[PDB]
Every structure is written in C-alpha cells, then in structure tokens.
Amino acid sequence: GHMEAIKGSDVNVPDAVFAWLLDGRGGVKPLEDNDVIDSQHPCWLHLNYTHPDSARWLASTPLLPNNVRDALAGESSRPRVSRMGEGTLITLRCILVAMRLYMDERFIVSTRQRKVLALDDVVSDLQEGTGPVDCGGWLVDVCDALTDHASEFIEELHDKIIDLEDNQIPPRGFLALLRKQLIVMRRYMAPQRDVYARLASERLPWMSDDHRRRMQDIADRLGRGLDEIDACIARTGIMADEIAQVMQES
C-alpha cells in the first residue's frame, strides 16, 4: 500500500476486452469510474491494442511510463521482463502469439491482438470465483496456464515422434515440420523460462514468498520442457539420417 490509489475513471477504457476489479476472493466485478483502485482492489485491464480507444489510452495515459507505450502497442517480440521503477514490463509467448503486460501492486494492463488461450483459463476461474485474489497471484496463474499449454504441446510433438520411430517411412515434409516446430519452441521458451526464474527471485513487493515459490516451480517445469524439446530435436536429426538409409535400400 506504499503506492497512491487510482480513480476508476482513469483506467475505464470503453472498448476494453476486460476491465475488472478483483474482489480479493477469487472473483471479479465490473470496473466503474467511481471505484478506487488500490492493492486490496487491483484492476485488471485487458486490451486489444488495435481497437481505437485502447490505442489512444495506451498512447496518452499518465499511468504508463513513456518508454513502455510502444511495447504494449505491440512493439515487442522476445519473452522478457523489465523494471520501470514501481512498474514491471513483461512480454510472454504462447503456442507464436504474444502477451504484453505492465503491472504494479495496484493494477495490470495487458494487451494483445490475437487471443491468448492461456488468459481464458484465468478469465474462466475469475468468472467462477476461483481465480487470483491479487496482482501477484494473477501473474503466477497466467504463467502457470501458459506453461500448461506449452507442456501439452511439447508432449504432443514427443508422441508423434515416438510414433514415427516405428510407423515405415514418414509422409513427405512431416519430419521436417516437427523439427521446425521444436526449434521454434526452443527459440522462444528458453528466454521465457528465464523470465519465470527472474520473477521467482526478484524481490517484488506485490509478489509473496509463496508466489515466488510457485513461480520457481513453473520455471523448473518449463526447464524440464526445454530438456525434452532438446532430446526430440536430436531424435529428428537421427531419424532423417536413418530415413535416408531406408530410401537407399530402395
């Protein structure tokens, strides 16, 4: 509560995908101009940075440092965390669609163009009254959902590959496709895994010890995923080589 409160009207963007106050018990209520936003009543503002009103807010609001306005407007790629004083700027990837957020103890503003399937898990939990109760718990639930999705996909590639290891030669272009996807997962998940690890050790006021603990688990989970991606990549290379032998045996 070391921070100054915010007026609802100050973050009440009309064309926002979501404009919510967390009720501190797992649910949400509609943001309103007269609400007071503080660390016990955080606001989550979710925007399509393409919609008119959203772009203008993003472009002019005093609540954002000048240097993050562009990022949130889409000008960011690599998974990354940064600190702009009291605030924290985070870019994350899903399986590659991107989620960009600026948040502090009082509020979160996240933006995207293409929908982030991970956020729907959090929105559903909130609608059900079983979501995050504060800003720290929100980021943790988001990073957890992103990791659920990344993990599920990594395992899907693993199974298709295991299948290939037996079932005859593969259809033309397929093995080359799996390899390409693994390499794309690797390129973006390695940095993102470092974002998780940093949030887990960085001393954030609005992140508790439990929060940093949950994150570290999420970071190790993802770490184990990159490990599996790497073994899979090696297998796709071995498979291509041995496929060439099968063909030469004509």
Q: Which is nearer to a copy of itself, 116 or 140 (CB)?
A: 116
Can residue 230 be called a binding residue for a copy of itself (CB under 8 A)? yes
Q: What is the number of other CB atoms lying within 10 angstroms of the CB of residue 238?
A: 11
Contact in structure between 148 and 95 (CB atoms under 8 Å): no
- The reply on whether position 237 binds Zn ion by CB under 5 A is no
Q: In the bound complex, what is the minimum distance in angstroms from residue 233's beta carbon to a copy of itself? A: 5
Q: Is-contact 106 38, C-beta < 8 A?
A: yes
What token pair was written down for 239? 């498979």
Return the ∠ at Cα 181 (arms to 119 and 156), rounded to 5°: 70
Sites for a copy of itself among residues 78-107 (CB under 8 A): 82-86
Which is nearest to 139 in space by CA: 202, 69, 229?
202
Does the footprint of Zn ion cover residue 1 (CB under 5 A)? yes
Residue 158 found at the interface with Zn ion (CB under 5 A): yes
Distance, in Å, from the CA atom of 158 to the CA atom of 236, rounded to the nearest integer, reads 10
Among a copy of itself, Zn ion, none, what binds residue 24 when CB lies within 5 to 8 Å by partner kind? none
Name the strand (E) or helix (H) holding 160: helix 135-164
Residue count, binding to a copy of itself (CB under 8 A): 39
Q: Which residues pair with 46 in a beta bridge?
A: 18, 110
The pair of structure tokens assigned to 127 is 């609608």
Q: Is 232 annotated as a binding residue?
A: yes
106 binds Zn ion (CB under 5 A): no
Smallest gap from Cβ 158 to a copy of itself, in A, equals 10
* 135 assigned ligand-binding residue: no
How far is residue 23's CA from residue 43's CA, in Å, rounded to a whole number? 10
Closest distance to Zn ion from the beta carbon of 214 (Å): 17
- From the list 35, 104, 121, 144, which residue makes contact with Zn ion (rule: CB under 5 A)? 121
Closer of 55 and 200 to Zn ion (Cβ): 200
34 binds, among a copy of itself, Zn ion, none (CB under 5 to 8 A by kind): none
Site string for a copy of itself, 124-143 (x = CB under 8 A): x--xx---------------
Among 12, 20, 31, 41, binds Zn ion (CB under 5 A): 41
For residue 49, how many other CB atoms are within 10 A of its CB?
Answer: 20
